[PDB]
Design a protein around this ligand. Sequence first.
Ligand SMILES: Cc1cc2nc3c(=O)[nH]c(=O)nc-3n(C[C@H](O)[C@H](O)[C@H](O)COP(=O)(O)O)c2cc1C
Ligand SMILES: Cc1cc2nc3c(=O)[nH]c(=O)nc-3n(C[C@H](O)[C@H](O)[C@H](O)COP(=O)(O)O)c2cc1C
Ligand SMILES: [Zn+2]
Ligand SMILES: [Zn+2]
Ligand SMILES: [Zn+2]
Lengths: 398, 398
Amino acid sequence: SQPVAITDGIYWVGAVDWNIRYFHGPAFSTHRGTTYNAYLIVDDKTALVDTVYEPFKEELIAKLKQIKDPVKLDYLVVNHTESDHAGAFPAIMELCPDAHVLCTQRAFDSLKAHYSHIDFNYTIVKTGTSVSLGKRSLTFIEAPMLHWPDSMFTYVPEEALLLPNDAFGQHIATSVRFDDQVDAGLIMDEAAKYYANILMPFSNLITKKLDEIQKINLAIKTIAPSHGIIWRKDPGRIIEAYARWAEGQGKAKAVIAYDTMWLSTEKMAHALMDGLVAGGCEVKLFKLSVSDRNDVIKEILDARAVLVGSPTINNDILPVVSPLLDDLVGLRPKNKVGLAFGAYGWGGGAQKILEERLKAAKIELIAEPGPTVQWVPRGEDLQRCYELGRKIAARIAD
Amino acid sequence: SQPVAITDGIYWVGAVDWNIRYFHGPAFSTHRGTTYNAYLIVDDKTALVDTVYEPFKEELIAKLKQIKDPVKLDYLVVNHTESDHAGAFPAIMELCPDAHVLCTQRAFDSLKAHYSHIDFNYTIVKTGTSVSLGKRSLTFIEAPMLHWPDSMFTYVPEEALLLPNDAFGQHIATSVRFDDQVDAGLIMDEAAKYYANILMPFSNLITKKLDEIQKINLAIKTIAPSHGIIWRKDPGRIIEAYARWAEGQGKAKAVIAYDTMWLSTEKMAHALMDGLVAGGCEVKLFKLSVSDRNDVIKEILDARAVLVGSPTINNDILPVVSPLLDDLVGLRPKNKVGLAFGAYGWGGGAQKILEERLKAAKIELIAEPGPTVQWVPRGEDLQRCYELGRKIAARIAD
Ligand SMILES: Cc1cc2nc3c(=O)[nH]c(=O)nc-3n(C[C@H](O)[C@H](O)[C@H](O)COP(=O)(O)O)c2cc1C
Ligand SMILES: Cc1cc2nc3c(=O)[nH]c(=O)nc-3n(C[C@H](O)[C@H](O)[C@H](O)COP(=O)(O)O)c2cc1C
Ligand SMILES: [Zn+2]
Ligand SMILES: [Zn+2]
Ligand SMILES: [Zn+2]
């Protein structure tokens, strides 16, 4: 209901989605819901940056009328189209027909494909362009593939305010809006879960756009993403985190995701971790069929090692392990070392599948044919897994 | 607690697992638990067929002492070594060290591998071989790869009793023991869920073994499998069923499994469905992220068509779909036609992975490059899917 002011004239007018437990379809789990943020700037000429997820258009409009009775809206910025952000696009245009749309090219094309039948004045914007609203203007910065092709940021220099959309956001539902009103530790963890699951494969593009904003000495006093809390107090903190995560130097940490039918593969898992811990390396042990794939990925962003295990069923992998694997192949973990392991009763087959997938994800296998075992692990075997983890530990060194 | 007599001198001494929900580890889901059946034959020389999942050894032993306290046990037959069956091997072997183990060769090897530190007077068995216990005797039938290499059935001619272990079994926990004491419809569906998820890839060996028993003209009056109910009143129906499923003639049915992020792919799934129903086909629609892969696989057993859709994320398939794909490749569905489909926003990529996996599962694509959409379905797009479902409907004809 109640809109929130970032500063005199600039307001937060999005909606909070408290009960959503899954975003991007069944992909990103939102244990704590999320929010669709939209920003209104009231000047001689008023602008609305991004909209809201369709099912929440009511709350948007309501918050809008909460600032000014008949909604003016001279400009309508669209940094992204996705849906969670442009779903209310139609509702809004019908509300303010003559509103002027400013966006990237691919954004315009996308906007035309996901809606059409919707007439509107536009004006393709490019990185560096600039429109004025009076006392305040709004320059832009193209942000291709920083999630999507049509992606871009919106910078209001007059207040050193940045509106990067999806980037720098976190999927959290809260009645509070700013980072100084949330636990510093918990909010950053969410920020990491978002990065790990969305921006992981675009790390290099990220370091780039980052340095770019630095070369231009853009004064970023506050960052207001399209999901979650608005970084008002310490915005340098996530800028720096992103910087760190994007480089991916990592920490002497190792994630072991796996699953088993009769425990043989599990034992191999303990042995690997026991050796890894001995090498002075932290370890996260995830039994896939009872762990959040999304949380497992978040843990990997930081780890310098990834070990996946599974026995073999019908000459193939254990289905439960498939999701993690293909999700890794698409996310492409920047600079990582890993291993594959598991048991079998006669022929095997999981090990090849695992190693091909792992290699496809660009994970440097610390020992090509990984530790496989027939039926049950033997002492010599567990010892082998032990030293192997011991070996990985030493490489992740730190 | 109490044992149940199948007939004078022959008792059910297994254990019922009411709370289990995931058998074979995270693989097969048992919405209604299961049982680990074990049978005791009291003749001039009492014998035990299989044991029980370790965690229920006390129950087994407890039940044995209830037939004859000082536990005799001249022979101990290991029809299968899996674990849900041989877990209490060491326990029963300690109870009676002097026991004569009867098993296959591969069984023996597995047994010596899974246990060792346990010696026992054995004697490899082969098809036809026969051991006498007095009035009653017991002949064995090797059943290689009928689930596992060491698999085999135990036949008691005097009673026309067949102890096939896993084959003909269903994962279901009931206080009652025989088929005539259970809903024919519900029990046969479980029997199918079992076959569909475990024996599906051995259909050919199934018909052959069934025929072999047909030649030998074995008199099967009752079938007591290792899991579930005991076919006492009508073994014919389950044998007919297995024979049918094994052939794989199928039914003019089609299973469409998929998942999406923003619906486009869902819409395609629908289009295809309509065209199929129009073609006079029965359809089952499954949004993978909300369905049981095991329940889905059960449905495919009868189906003559398998369609799998998915959008494309990070140039790969949506992780949620991975499981089905990999479970199918391993399961190798006999005589099935299929089609892959889905949307993309710019590059695409899930279609190749889909057709790749689908082919690898030995599924005949009705149209190599399957239907694909960019962003949102258009009129012709859906019409196209319609026609395609219409085409598959035509081929599955019946
Ligand atoms: C349904 C089922 C199917 C199996 N298929 C294969 C197979 O194709 N090839 C193989 O080498 N082992 C197969 N096995 C044996 C397992 O790979 C072996 O028991 C292993 O020790 C299990 O590892 P775990 O205890 O970590 O689950 C199969 C086991 C089960 C229960
Ligand atoms: C996290 C995310 C990642 C994506 N990655 C790709 C990609 O690599 N290639 C592509 O062509 N489209 C990509 N898309 C776009 C979707 O394929 C496209 O929006 C499609 O219309 C969604 O299908 P659906 O409505 O069935 O969920 C991506 C979308 C999201 C939200
Ligand atoms: Zn709200
Ligand atoms: Zn009891
Ligand atoms: Zn319809």
